[PDB]
Amino acid sequence: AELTPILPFLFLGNEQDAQDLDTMQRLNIGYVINVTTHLPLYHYEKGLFNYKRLPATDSNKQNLRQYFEEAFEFIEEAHQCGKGLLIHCQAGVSRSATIVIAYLMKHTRMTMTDAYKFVKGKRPIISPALNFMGQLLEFEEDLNNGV
Ligand SMILES: CSc1scc2c1-c1nc(SCC(=O)C(C)(C)C)ncc1CC2
């Protein structure tokens, strides 16, 4: 089990990490973002967390930018209510790390590169995806130009 803490209230993991109900509970997690389409929402039957599925695939054509602000609003719900969010996808953490970096660019004032470094220092293995890097570049331009 390896639930990396990015911020005190924001956690990053893969499929295997999201199946530990005992560690999720120890970290005061009450929100879960599942950035896959086929995986189950783990522990939905226990009525312990609030969930959100961003239905995405690890494809070169997948748009994750459409989901950014739907996520940012679910993250800020947790930030305010005093609970933790787990954004998880699959082994490479390509999709979930993309959203994590995006939030750190809009709500922390970081640049894309500083965000990537911040996140790689805590979870050292984030496998690459050129499709998502391009979307972050566009997002960085949109924020500096007030959009
Ligand atoms: C937006 S990434 C970025 S910004 C500056 C650099 C990089 C980078 N990223 C990656 S892996 C991509 C990731 O982590 C996901 C996109 C899947 C979240 N390999 C190499 C580099 C070179 C240096």
Side-chain angles (χ1 to χ4, degrees), residues 65 69 106 138-147:
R65 179 70 221 284
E69 238 294 328
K106 183 146 190 172
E138 295 217 285
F139 190 57
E140 207 189 37
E141 226 173 64
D142 271 335
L143 302 146
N144 296 340
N145 301 334
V147 196

Side-chain angles (χ1 to χ4, degrees), residues 66-79 81-108 110-124:
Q66 51 172 331
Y67 299 133
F68 275 0
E69 238 294 328
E70 188 192 331
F72 301 161
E73 78 104 3
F74 205 64
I75 299 164
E76 289 278 43
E77 278 181 34
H79 201 25
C81 86
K83 304 285 271 165
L85 193 125
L86 169 59
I87 188 149
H88 90 272
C89 76
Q90 291 197 267
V93 188
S94 295
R95 281 159 292 174
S96 38
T98 290
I99 281 75
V100 164
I101 286 188
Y103 172 73
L104 297 159
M105 289 166 25
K106 183 146 190 172
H107 290 72
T108 287
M110 294 198 223
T111 70
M112 205 219 301
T113 283
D114 300 37
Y116 168 89
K117 286 215 92 199
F118 185 83
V119 178
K120 186 118 193 117
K122 312 170 126 51
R123 203 163 224 281

Side-chain angles (χ1 to χ4, degrees), residues 16-32:
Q16 297 219 177
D17 298 329
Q19 327 205 31
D20 212 324
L21 180 60
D22 276 53
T23 324
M24 260 162 58
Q25 272 164 348
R26 280 187 215 125
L27 290 159
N28 203 31
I29 277 154
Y31 298 79
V32 177

Side-chain angles (χ1 to χ4, degrees), residues 127-141:
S127 73
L130 273 157
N131 164 240
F132 302 157
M133 304 182 64
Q135 298 177 32
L136 291 173
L137 205 73
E138 295 217 285
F139 190 57
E140 207 189 37
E141 226 173 64

